[model samples]
Target chain A: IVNSHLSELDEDVFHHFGFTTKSFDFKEKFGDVKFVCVCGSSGRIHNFAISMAKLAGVENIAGSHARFVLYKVDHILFADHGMGIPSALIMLHEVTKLLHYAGCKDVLFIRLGTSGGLGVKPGTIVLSDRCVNTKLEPYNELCILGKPVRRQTIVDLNTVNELKKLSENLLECSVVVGGTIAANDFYEEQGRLDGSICTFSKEEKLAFLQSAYEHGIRNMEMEGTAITSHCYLTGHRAILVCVTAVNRLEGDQITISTDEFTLFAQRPGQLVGEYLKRNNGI
Target chain B: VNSHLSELDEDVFHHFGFTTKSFDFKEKFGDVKFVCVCGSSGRIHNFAISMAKLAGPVENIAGSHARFVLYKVDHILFADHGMGIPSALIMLHEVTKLLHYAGCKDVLFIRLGTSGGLGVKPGTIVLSDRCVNTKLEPYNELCILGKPVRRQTIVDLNTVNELKKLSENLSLECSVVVGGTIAANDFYEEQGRLDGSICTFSKEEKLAFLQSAYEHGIRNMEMEGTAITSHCYLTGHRAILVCVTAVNRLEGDQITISTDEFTLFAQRPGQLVGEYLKRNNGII
Candidate 1:
């Protein structure tokens, strides 16, 4: 209830998710939510919810929203943020309000997705201790009322440490904790030479990648800065863990096959599920 | 295709989850001349299938990609651009390159989606003559490899005139107006909505912003028009945006409309785009 305007309206429509106060009781439905797992692909996060729920049963709580998917089981809610920071930012606003209205306390946000590896081996999971912007700053600069408003994009250190120790049990892919650069787009901003529109040379692309590597950016993803900034402002604990799709040192394009990457895709969720089960004493 | 593609023997449109070697691009998509882009994955497919059912058939052309949906009907292609500029940018690049590889020429890309009208009546179809970003700049300032690269985002009036000329014959009760569009970065703060979880302005400030946009002829606000216009222009492809205003921001922020009415209002632009495709008389 930090936002006073929310109380003036009789209804709060989480339009992107299709869940709203007018349609159902968000308080009763989500009051117990403690962990929110967000990802790019809806199916992956939905499966993540089911994986954590195990026997509790999973349901598409968003239900025909089409734009995004939402699932709530046990004390965790699963959501899909679609593709970029702009899209992820919207879900965070709505999700924050949904939880605020639900009266849930101390919720943890865990982002799981894949990204273009900076220098790591393919399929290696990089735990984002920090999220940088296109300029390598650890902030999400948003325009509010036509002015730049920057927010800190730091992840919780303790959570990363816990996940680090938890990774010792898993051998699918080694986990590395480093910074991540949240490029505004998948192509040029990320220093890829393969976009439909590119003016920079191959040498220019590699120089940027190597420079990012020098700055401790292990991977690049779109969702990092958005998630980190939202949690920072709203005072919620969050962490970003993503798998590397390709080694930028080796090539710009993804060299791994889809099936091979699929095996690596769920490692973050699998690791987060372990954290949730153990932390919750389930 | 852009010259940067020369560095690689193979290009993988990572967002689409497909590579150039995965399938036959030319044989499968050589005939495409028009692409209808929308914001939602579900509605875009609906538009393609609906276009197909009207004496037509559709096929999903997207390979191994869950992020975006692509469907082809005759000489027209339909795709969902996900949501924001970033998402749509990735889609734009991949699709343009896909068409480029297929040797597509004179491809006219049109976006049909719902937007919040600045002052126009709800359900009215707004055609974008040009687009500006939240800063009211008529160009996209893309940071390409750590540097700012400005690209003009003006929609070629030729396509706008073609659509307007095509519109006079179409049967529709809603008004069709050509005006400027504001390409917002986010749905809430950039659009001056009061309901978002992180609103920083008051109701009066929001009203003034809308009024200012109206003064500049920004009839509607959306996420992809700038990226669409600029990307298409840079690629030498023709493009325009045919969007239906879901709500008048002058009235209120929340999209308070019936689901039935929403679908019906969208048909105003959808039918016009369908008619545009019909007049092309294209072959599959």
Candidate 2:
């Protein structure tokens, strides 16, 4: 069964994506899809889809704008997974099921988005080697039936090395492969003092960050662990490539100019765009 | 010093699909005294249309055509926060910042949605007096900077009581009660729904969990209550979660109601809140 949770029907409507399986022929339309890239924001993913289309020399792949959902072009499907574990997991389940229903095989799931760096500078891309939980464990716990069901947070090591090599040769931007601490929320969970409620002292916050850095967390984001766990459980290759919007060691707020931020945000898309072009022989 | 929203001017616009420069925030949103949010886009759209009808003439605010967010009526803002805590929190953060920038004051943030009822009949309206985590703890922990910060998940007791009283006076067709809500991150395993592919416990264990929740006064289960309550509690804004029970957990996991029947069931909370808002002197 593609999705045990879903009904056993030929045609099913996905609630979040606003599309039904009956709308298109699965094998004809999506059997050749070899890559599915996801991000947090819809606008960025749409831009990435356009960039990917341009790289692949394809046109009219960016039409049918639902604004805040998934879009596909050629062998790659781009989507906005919202944010955090719950939102990411929902999309992963549906997308994975969609692939299975379409008879797609060996798809590379790439999550490209923004993150808060530990000690690295802003605009530095971190390819997540491992996603750790708040307890510093390399696992994500989904409370199943009131019990903690743990899934190992691992990514495709080969993909990491290949992307690292590609980053060095294909792009001018700085990139690093390191562990990531996937927090639950943007504030408080990441130890920022600027949330509406902050209870911990500044010393405590710094100590926590220092400990995370010592544990090899080069960056922090919300969706890495969930994505890794979901992909791992469902037998798919996955990797997270996130650009640091701000360095937690320096400050919590991202103070970069809009133009600079836009360029930084496009760096991962550029890397992925080049990687796909090289791997797929586009 | 508070943590400033970084690159806020553009970032907010990107995340929310609306720029501050695009509209006069003070003139458009300054009068927003209530913000009602729900889970799904379809439900919220229906609620927005209903609200517009209830508020008299249906008037679409200028530059408010964005999908899946911020449908502004005369004084209330209606939005759909998508699904879980992450989606809800992002909306909360951006909307809070927008409201603050617009100089909106004393805004009553209410969440009207659906939930699985515990030890209660289906179609019961649960006004969450407090929200708890998977462990029954009345707090929401967020990993900030790098540390775990916990915020109390509490709603306004006066608001809950007033809503309950208002439900009684309106002669609504549903059973309205005040109880704690167990806010789970995932719908299946976290809430002990056996339908998910990942199930580690038995049916007995699931019953125990529900019994424990019932003992702790948890009458409903949903995704966004804890985040909503915690954010409102920390920000000193009044908040309440009004969710109708889609299915009784003790009975089954799947919502076996007819589509027409479920639509009617989902409308109870909005009707109660709409009635309360109309009776109150908040709107002209």
Candidate 3:
């Protein structure tokens, strides 16, 4: 967080979330925010917000734009980051600043989304112990002022273990913690024969997967590294929980029934919702 | 395109939720010639609907799955890229293959969306002549098989010339510029903005970055230009990037425009393409 810059702003218009610093009293409305669970889509997070209403809670009024959706279920805030790093980063920056301005402390950040697994079976819930980028490094790479900058992508070990243990009592699927390789390109980087352009052989795909497995990398998703890095940089506890939709070792395509897919997709949200309930008295 | 596919093997475009077995590529999309894409899902659908009105009524063929919306109006194919290179890369690959299996030839790809103007005025339709990443390098770099794979992003000048001509001839209340574009991964810092959730640099440093960008021939900034250009370059397809500057970075970082005004400015690029395509609608 750039303290000097933030203090100088006329109003912190969270351009993406559709709110500003002056729009609402952050201390009163969002100060109680203890848990923030970000997903990849507005509908899914809205579903999280609704499920929490039954188990724990809006169309809880989003802002003037539809770039993302924002909702709160008691002390928890459910927001969507669209799909990849750039979109997800906007949410992280704004939401982190949102929390910072609210004087929120000791907050737990959870990224709940569906993912392609490394070797795990479909419907298995994978809790990210740590995150790495395509280069197999635990860093969030960014270019600032025409120069490359790298930040350590850290995850709270205590938060991961808590989520792992909570899922054991609450989840219907297998839960495990392992490293995740967050790829910018979902097809070629993660190694699939399906992207419009595939330059590598199936043999090469297997080799890459084996190398990833040798490093304890158990899942592949787009936004994990950014989620962990931003949360850590902002002094918040963050954990990435994803329900395996497809195991790349088997095949790239997510060949699952719609009902089964729908059910598995709910696991991450359910795990977090239960955790939130236990803490918030839903 | 990958040459490894066999006639017997079926492939799925996962992000798009389409596969060879269920989707008939040839019958439905054989006539596709113009493939148009944009960054936002919300904006793309609106633009696709606006573009579709030129010919007739059309629908999103992406069916029950809603990650990326797909629509065909006349010879034009439109879809939202979600956002950024990774997501845009997915859309381009799927749509390219969707056209490939259909035996479509000489398809022109055009990316129409909004961007922040570097030195150009707000609402100016900046037609990108080429695109560079945050390093000011005119290429798209990605990790494939744990190695950095770089592809040069050179836009088709022929298409940019046409878009520029259309911009002048159109009735839209906006100026147009043809120059280089800066494609960054993040909306804030990478673009040298002082207004993200976090800012690492000072106001003086941000202005320096902006000045360097302007000095390098960059007149516009967005997240997904090189991804489109570089992918199209690899596929041997002619591509053009036309972005309507939503905000002038010389003035501010936040878009700050009102909702109605923003909506009006958003359609200028698509509107230009809509008119450009309509010109040849009868014979082409």
Candidate 4:
């Protein structure tokens, strides 16, 4: 049975997705979905949907031209979760409820996007074994009832192992598995000196990054820990697979060429595409 | 000069998803006199369409990509600021920079959103005189470089009065009041809602907080009020936060209103704003 907090008498309308249980037939529309992939940008998710659709041998998928809040092809659902933890958390809530209402089972959740490398190469793929906060604690703290509540930032080790194996065999880029430090903001929180406001010196930032590296964090991003916490608490399998856009140990800004960066960004999507094909026997 | 913007070239592209070199801001947004932001993508779209209709046939801008949705009608810009304070703060930063780059002056920044009512009845619209935090301080505390940087959450008194005058002229069915709004980080727990995954406070404790807020003239609870007020205050921009109460915390937790009823309630602020713009000659 799908567990939902919504009242039985209430008709749940997902405002962000522009769909409600009463308006759209969830059972008929999303019943067959077995995999849901979310990323940061709508452009990335749209591209991933087309790639997944082509891999699934679905020809001439209409509505592929326009940007979509939610898109599905066959048994896979693709969505843009936007930036930051709060934005991703909101989408996670609605999408989890969405799948539950559709009576879908054994759904696997994956986040494919880019992140700043801790000490790894710029194009290295990081499969997050665990997610932590800036304090190096494995928790996503949320304020509930005017008090602090924390959820463990744990991911399925089985899923992590499978993704690592897939990356090793299929991807040409190096894949590193380690804890990911999820920052709240992109600039100051991540120790970028180029932000509008910078108080800490270069020495302090290097010490912070070096400490994170010693503590087993190989990459940093904005959404990994929150995504892990939300999925784990909801009784779903989740993993974060991200490509390092720039090596933070080297520099704060992404100085890579646009062509090189685009190729690096596609690495996570390609790995997920192959993993899905192998598991689904497509 | 632009404030709080580093790498004017890359920061513009990173935050707004538009590069300064490729996009001409002055040509596109020079006429923008007002920016009305709200939470949720659906509500902003509804407000945008309604404002477009009131502005006499508006065209949709092409950049509807990802979290940032931008729509233009006359001199008013409608945007969705997403959920929390950080999201809304990011939008404010980018939009403020965009307007500055466009040479747009005296832009009236307004936020129209839904909130949990404090002591008032549900569906009442609130024009915030000031915004505060849980500590009852009229400031937004941002952690910058591991230090708490505080910005005052003050709105223009004249703008609030003007909006109130417009609301009275419209004779809105919902009661319009002026009071302080508390912007919480999370919708569930920070607002003292018990329906979250975890609840630490008892009902009595929650009620105590509510009573204190009521005593402090807190009329509603939402996520973006303080952040919006702080940004406008710091940037020398005028702003007002107007929100409609979805549910009265003293009464219940869940929003049990019908969809039609909620839609009408949500449209109250949009109607008021549209009327204000039309009467102010904002609709050239």
Query: What residue runs in model 3 are displaced by over 4 Å at the alpha carbon?
Result: B282-284
Candidate 3 — number of clashing residue pairs? Answer: 2
The deviation in Å at residue B79 for candidate 1 is: 1.2
**Candidate 3's residue-wise lDDT over B1-284, tens digit each?**
57655532777666666677876888888888888888766677787777666665556788465578888887888888876887788788788888888888778888887888988888888989889998789999899988889999979898789778877777778888999999999998899888776678878888888888888899999999989888876776778888989888977888787777777888888778888887866113
lDDT of 2 by residue, A39-149 (tens): 877777888888777766622222142223777777788888877788787687667767876888767899998888988988999998998887788888777655567
DockQ of each: 0.67, 0.29, 0.70, 0.23
lDDT of each: 0.83, 0.76, 0.82, 0.76
**Model 3: clashing residue pairs?**
A52-A57, A53-A57
Instruction: Decide which is better by lDDT, 1 or 3.
Output: 1
Give me the displacement of residue B150 in model 2, in angstroms.
Answer: 4.1
Q: Among these predicted structures, which one has the highest DockQ?
A: 3
Per-residue lDDT of model 3, residues A1-282, tens digit only: 445677777877676767678889988888889988888867778887898888753565457565788888788888988778888898888888888888998677888888888878899888888899987899999999888899888888887888788876655568989999898977888898877789898899999988897789888989988888888778887889898899888888777865677788888887777777777724
Ten residues in a row with the worst lDDT in model 1 chain B? B55-64
- Per-residue CA lDDT of model 1 for A1-282, tens digit only, reads 367788998877677877568777878888888888999888888888888778443778784744688887788888999888889988898898888888877677999999988778888989988998878888887876667788888698899998999999766677999999887788878887777877877787788889889999899988798888887677688899899988876777877777777778888877888788788723
Candidate by candidate, in order, the iRMS in Å equals 1.6, 4.6, 1.6, 4.9
- TM-score for each predicted model, relative to the true structure: 0.96, 0.81, 0.96, 0.81
Off by over 4 Å in 1: A55-57, B55-57, B282-284
Q: lDDT score, residue A14, model 4? A: 60
Q: Under CAPRI classification, how is model 3 graded?
A: medium
Task: For candidate 1, list the clashing residue pairs, or say none.
Answer: B52-B56
